[PDB]
Amino acid sequence: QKLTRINDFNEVLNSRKSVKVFDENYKIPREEMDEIITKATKAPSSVNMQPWRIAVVQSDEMKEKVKESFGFNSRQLTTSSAMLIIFGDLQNYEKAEQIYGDAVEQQLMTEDIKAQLLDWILPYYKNLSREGMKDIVNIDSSLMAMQLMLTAKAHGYDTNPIGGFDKENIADIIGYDSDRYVPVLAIAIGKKAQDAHDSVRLPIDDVREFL
Amino acid sequence: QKLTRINDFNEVLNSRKSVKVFDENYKIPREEMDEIITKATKAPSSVNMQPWRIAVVQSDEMKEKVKESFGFNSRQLTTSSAMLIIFGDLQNYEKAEQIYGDAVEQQLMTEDIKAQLLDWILPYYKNLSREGMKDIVNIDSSLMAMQLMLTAKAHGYDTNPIGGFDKENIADIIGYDSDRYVPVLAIAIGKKAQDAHDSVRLPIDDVREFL
Amino acid sequence: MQKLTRINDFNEVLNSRKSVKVFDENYKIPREEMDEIITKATKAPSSVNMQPWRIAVVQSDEMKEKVKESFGFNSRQLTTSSAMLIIFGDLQNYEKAEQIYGDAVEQQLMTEDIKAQLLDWILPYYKNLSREGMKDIVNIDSSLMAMQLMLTAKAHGYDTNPIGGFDKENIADIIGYDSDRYVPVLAIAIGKKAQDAHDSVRLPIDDVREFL
Amino acid sequence: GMQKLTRINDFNEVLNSRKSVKVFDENYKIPREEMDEIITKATKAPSSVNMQPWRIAVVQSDEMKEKVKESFGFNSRQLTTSSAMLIIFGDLQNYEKAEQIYGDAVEQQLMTEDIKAQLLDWILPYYKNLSREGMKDIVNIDSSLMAMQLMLTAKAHGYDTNPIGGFDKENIADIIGYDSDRYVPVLAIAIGKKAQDAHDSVRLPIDDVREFL
């Protein structure tokens, strides 16, 4: 099965499904993984603070270290080209200067406006509770995740989003500071070896209401 | 006035930006809003439990009732064709029998599989802490939200995801049970009246690494 | 979509206000909502706006346990209720006259001049009332508020049972209030119903009203 | 005249607009059908052992207004201009209606005769042996509960009221022809169509009137 790119928006959305068995002999070139991640990170985020951080778990070394933490999802882990583990940086505002300074350098805003924005943004973010900030980073990182899955599909790959992993211990196992980086979601990615099962969705009346 | 659609996936992704001023006289036909939402809700969710609930705020009356709660986001609120307020249902498992029943009716699984899945899913979901369930529904609802913003853009509309609203009171203001439904984020949607500002993203090396 | 339980039709609220005696023991009314109900209840009228009512909201296991014997045969309501509201009347209610009428000046409803003219007759009137006469005043005022409380509770989706059968001689002391100053008027059990109220009969109105 | 007025059906609107109006339209009179609807709803109020001790003198005639005029003292404008001055009395021998009330419950299939007898077996000795002061407390409370509901219902019908305690309670029963030993005045309520807006009034912060225990 040739890798087959998909250019049509509706066809990408329609083909995005949870594949759970990938081709073990297919590895995604780094340059292509970086293109996919670059596209995903164009996602929006609260005050453009981009709190998402991705561990691209490709080696047998690291996969083996995290295998038990993935429990009944071991076969996605085993067969995938990579297991992407998406964390949220609870001190994401540490990059405010870099990010907003980049906007100034790229002539998207003046320094004057950068200072006026950051004068309210920084105290707001710094004063958030841990729980409030966890909510923020979970939401932003998930927005990026969805765009990642769609882009992966456009490139001809398939994914499986995964929450059934040990979120209490995963940062420690991989070596990230568990006080600062909270795991949000994992995404298995690769070339499909088995078709996804189709799934149902609720009737629209069960999920939206006009007011 | 039929809007110009965007059929190419990459162009849709590249064109998704936060628009904050909409055409006040342009209202999205209900059939089209429902097509957008139907496409959005093909997003994945944990155990396919689809905890998202969208309040499509479009009337003068409800817009006026929620105006104070939107604070400095009044322009998006007033000019939008709709302000979508996305809640997560903390008791989303009450629809498990319905959803999984639908999967058997549509020949996607046999009843033995359905029963075995529910035998572990229900206890797990029913015994999660409020905070744990809040994490699940924030993540799922955000996945859906991203697909909604992209679909809206494919349709020629624009959006602005919004977090700066009174989440403590919003459920009560609109009449939803705040014990069951937590607000996740809002999305202003309509026909653009002012171009979005372009914005920067972090270099790839500051957001991902290979392990 | 699961909504807040509200009854907004005025007649519907009055019609469904019935004495519920068995409540859902697991359901507790959030404080914000109790305060909203009490805020609306206290919009009731009172003689010279002196607002003599004082509400002990008995919700804790410890205080429930303490008042339990005082509630005698109303044990179903005390036990199962989200709260037992015990309404007292302040026989020295006029001690808040400067505060109350002061707030009216602050809120631009009357001038200080008018506040002084009013209090110049109201204070000697209230201060020279007998104990029994003041008890009549606070019983009436507190009952007016209590009815509006029960109606507002029903409008919020809750039910009530007004209760007079408790130990009024000792309840103030049990709760920690000065029995000389604060007289018990009535108690109101409040919560989410676990059993429908029994319906009750009313007299034909021509046995209780006449045109003169 | 006697036009039926604009109703307020929203519970919060009714509660928010219930204020003491002291000047009514002197030429507006409330039709009996409407006053009776108002009283019918009001008497759905609860009362101790459902004994319903309230008795309403609906003073509407020029003749009876004149008779009670001096008894209303500085409340003369409310009396004069009102469609009616309601004077609510409490019956200190309210248990004389027990057989009727409880009998009606049996007739209406809300309880068995068997249960009615058991209830009255304790209720009657209890009520008949209360002190005069204890009974006055009961009837004041019950009648006040009904009075609040009457004022709200009146407002829902588009009318306004003014509760009034400043009248001659010592003599009012005798003046209108009620047995002053048996019937005690609780409060009066002026009712009519407003001719001037009520003054807005303040309430204490709730922290001064309630606490959680």
Ligand SMILES: Cc1cc2nc3c(=O)[nH]c(=O)nc-3n(C[C@H](O)[C@H](O)[C@H](O)COP(=O)(O)O)c2cc1C
């Ligand atoms: C969760 C979330 C909350 C946001 N809150 C607001 C908001 O309250 N008001 C607003 O104008 N924009 C809000 N934004 C828009 C962001 O500022 C915007 O996405 C970011 O600056 C990137 O710009 P772009 O969306 O044009 O790519 C929010 C975005 C997200 C994802």
Ligand SMILES: Cc1cc2nc3c(=O)[nH]c(=O)nc-3n(C[C@H](O)[C@H](O)[C@H](O)COP(=O)(O)O)c2cc1C
């Ligand atoms: C946040 C999240 C967590 C998930 N967790 C797992 C998981 O641990 N293991 C797994 O096999 N699938 C997992 N799923 C996949 C869902 O079961 C799947 O998305 C859902 O059944 C819908 O099917 P679809 O993705 O093919 O549309 C997860 C999905 C999401 C969004």
Ligand SMILES: Cc1cc2nc3c(=O)[nH]c(=O)nc-3n(C[C@H](O)[C@H](O)[C@H](O)COP(=O)(O)O)c2cc1C
């Ligand atoms: C002042 C007062 C005291 C009451 N005392 C009790 C009581 O001690 N125990 C009880 O079960 N009900 C008590 N009741 C409830 C009455 O029995 C009830 O209101 C009456 O039977 C009418 O029924 P309803 O409230 O359902 O309309 C009391 C009611 C009032 C107004």
Ligand SMILES: Cc1cc2nc3c(=O)[nH]c(=O)nc-3n(C[C@H](O)[C@H](O)[C@H](O)COP(=O)(O)O)c2cc1C
């Ligand atoms: C029991 C009672 C007796 C009252 N007595 C009089 C009275 O004699 N004359 C009068 O003008 N108002 C009287 N008032 C009206 C009060 O002054 C009024 O309710 C209070 O100032 C609150 O204003 P509001 O009713 O507009 O909310 C009485 C009220 C009550 C409840």
Ligand SMILES: [Ca+2]
């Ligand atoms: Ca830079």
Ligand SMILES: [Ca+2]
């Ligand atoms: Ca500059």
Ligand SMILES: [Ca+2]
């Ligand atoms: Ca650390």
Ligand SMILES: [Ca+2]
């Ligand atoms: Ca009969």
Ligand SMILES: [Ca+2]
């Ligand atoms: Ca029998």
